[PDB]
Symmetry: C3
Subunit: 308 residues, 3 copies
């Protein structure tokens, strides 16, 4: 088997999202820029390492790549590649705008092409089963579009960012009903439970993208999106003992994207002098949770329980 699962890209993804969240606090906190730089450098290094490993997988393990691509449930994790590329481009935009733009456009084209080729192929039917409605399906249809929207808005194409953000938002509102119904009805196998953290992602990722597109102006839509995001956060907080029933694992990084988007939208809200205490608590909670995830990952690396 391939040592690095395609789902391990959540590590650089979460680190990059938290790096941007810290970057948003440059003016208010002098060491915020240094913390963001450290997080972004670590995320970029990890992403480069994982991209080299995945290129090796394509060169020598193409059978596994095709098996995961054609699998109706495991294909969604391939969307973590363009998302992480877009986030790393967002990070590099603070230093070298040209390479940042190149990475952002490569990631946008890659994720859009992947969604067009695969997510649309499911409509043929037969391969997608009622038991394949997993939270990981958000990544190609929802998370990728939101990340592309935010990245493009960062480059100055707000209208295109609005298009991508709307695609992501409506895809999320269109897929979540069936996902939650399946979770209520068919439960979820213990191995796939850790991916439930992605249910926290779309609500906060959407508001983060919206605040990035419209210059961080806190509309009514941003407040509504936080309302739903915090409802989902409470639901998943009550369920965490059930999610980790079989013990902690690297699969808990699925919460990383949601927590980092929560932190970013929290900085956006605090800048706007709206719900300041809630924003501070959300930022602290997300940072502490991602720090615990980092500590757990380092522990797993030390004990060798990281790679497969």
């Amino acid at each position: 088997p391939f040592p690095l699962p395609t789902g391990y890209f959540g590590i650089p993804l979460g680190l990059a999202a938290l790096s941007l969240a810290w970057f948003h606090l440059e003016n208010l906190f002098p060491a915020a820029r240094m913390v963001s730089d450290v997080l972004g450098i670590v995320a970029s290094a990890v992403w480069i390492l994982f991209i080299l490993m995945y290129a090796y997988k394509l060169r020598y393990y193409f059978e596994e790549v095709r098996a995961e691509y054609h699998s109706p449930v495991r294909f969604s994790f391939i969307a973590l590649i363009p998302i992480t590329t877009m986030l790393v481009g967002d990070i590099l935009y603070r230093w070298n705008p040209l390479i940042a733009e190149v990475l952002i456009w490569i990631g946008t084209i890659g994720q859009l092409l992947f969604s067009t080729l695969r997510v649309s192929e499911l409509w043929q039917g037969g391969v997608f089963e009622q038991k394949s409605t997993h939270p990981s399906f958000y990544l190609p249809a929802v998370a990728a579009n939101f990340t592309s929207a935010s990245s493009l808005a960062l480059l100055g194409y707000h209208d295109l960012g609005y298009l991508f953000f709307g695609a992501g938002m409506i895809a999320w509102i269109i897929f979540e009903p069936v996902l939650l119904q399946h979770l209520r009805i068919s439960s979820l196998e213990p191995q796939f439970r850790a991916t439930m953290g992605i249910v926290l992602a779309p609500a906060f990722v959407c508001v983060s993208a919206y605040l990035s597109i419209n210059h961080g102006e806190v509309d009514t839509l941003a407040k509504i999106l936080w309302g739903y995001g915090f409802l989902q956060l409470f639901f998943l907080l009550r369920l965490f003992p059930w999610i980790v029933e079989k013990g902690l694992n690297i699969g808990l990084w699925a919460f990383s994207f949601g927590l980092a988007s929560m932190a970013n939208s929290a900085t956006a809200f605090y800048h706007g002098n709206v719900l300041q205490g809630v924003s501070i608590f959300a930022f602290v909670f997300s940072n502490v949770m991602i720090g615990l995830l980092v500590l757990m990952t380092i522990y797993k690396l030390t004990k060798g329980q990281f790679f497969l």
Copy 2:
């Protein structure tokens, strides 16, 4: 069996919502305040009586309480307690702001805790079944959040009201698809048919909460929400002979919350000089329907067919 079903709290709920709807007409009609006071006093008295009965149930009939709480379909009716508490607090806010604030906060905390503890356990799966997707599921996930949003906005916490309103709105949009699909596919047993009136609730409750949060400004969102609410109202009007196929019962109070929210949003629309004729018709229709419900309830009390 306990003489008072948990679903009988719709009586004080509907009466309180209609009381607030009338209250919103303080300046236009001199007798609106008197009518609102009478309705609110009756609703508060009935709510106090029912709360005493439910405390008795907890003290002596805790097995039934545990059975309904753990039931995947009957748990949603326990959410009528905090909703009625918040509505009674809204009523009392006209007389005793401190007691009203206390009741509103108790109701908000109670409903949020109930949704966190129960509506999220369903995601574990195995207890919720495709035949348990009933209209009553709106109460803990949708109606409670909207009522908390409106109550908080009445206290002055608009941003928190916006958060709760968004939670409720997105929960409604996420749950209605599967609910309507189940209704189309699996029908609904005659005993649970009267609860179909809750399908009317979310569309009008959402617009009522929105108009309460934003100072009763008739935005485009309010018009859209009335569009959907009136579509659902026509759908349920065409189905009423089917809903009461087995005869009228106290379960028809499920329409009470929807009709009262329709009346409240109608007052809000009329104040804003938007669709005055439609607003007048909606207000009259809601008042007449709730009056018919009150007459039916009084007749059942006289006949002795009210308590179980």
Copy 3:
């Protein structure tokens, strides 16, 4: 077997929608008015012919009419009559406002009554099956409401137009989740595949109606709706070889309404100096595709493969 299927009304519907799309370009081009006039006259003539055919069907083949109406899947195509009536009224509004208003009101009342009588009757259940969740269900619940909203906004009743637009939009958001889940799970049979083009309709029809109601002001909602519409457009472009797996047929006119709404919203966007290149490409693509559909229909008529 009546020669003209009820689903052939998409021809006058698509032609009329494209006629309005061209009509929106009077001032920019000199020949736009002439092209719109030609398209509208052809659409009106075809609609009159089809309405005479359907009146003949009702007078002599009422059994087929009653069979399609009571069929849970074939009933949705009866909604093409009021939709095409409203579109033809929109066309005639440029020449004779009184007859245009009469046609728009007749179509609005007809579609609303049909949705109330039939779409609501499904909630009784037992006739609608999980395999009856076809894309054609958009027509009575979604497309009709949007067309009524746009036509009413043309007459000057913006608030009523907003009500109808909101009804249609929320109905679309509430139905699409289960429709897409059904498409993913169970393959659409080859004969029903051509109707997949209706999946492209709601996203663009919604934005067209929104831009018509609000005087063609490109709002954030319009950009979001284009985002989703273009996502669906790419999904269906990737699937087209599968949709026509068994050969081209008149059922491909299902794409006509979506493409015409695309063209209309493209004119609206270009007028507003928003994404001019994307708008031009969308307009050209929609016009070319509808022209190809027209050529295919002409060839089928020449070969005698049009009527049943």
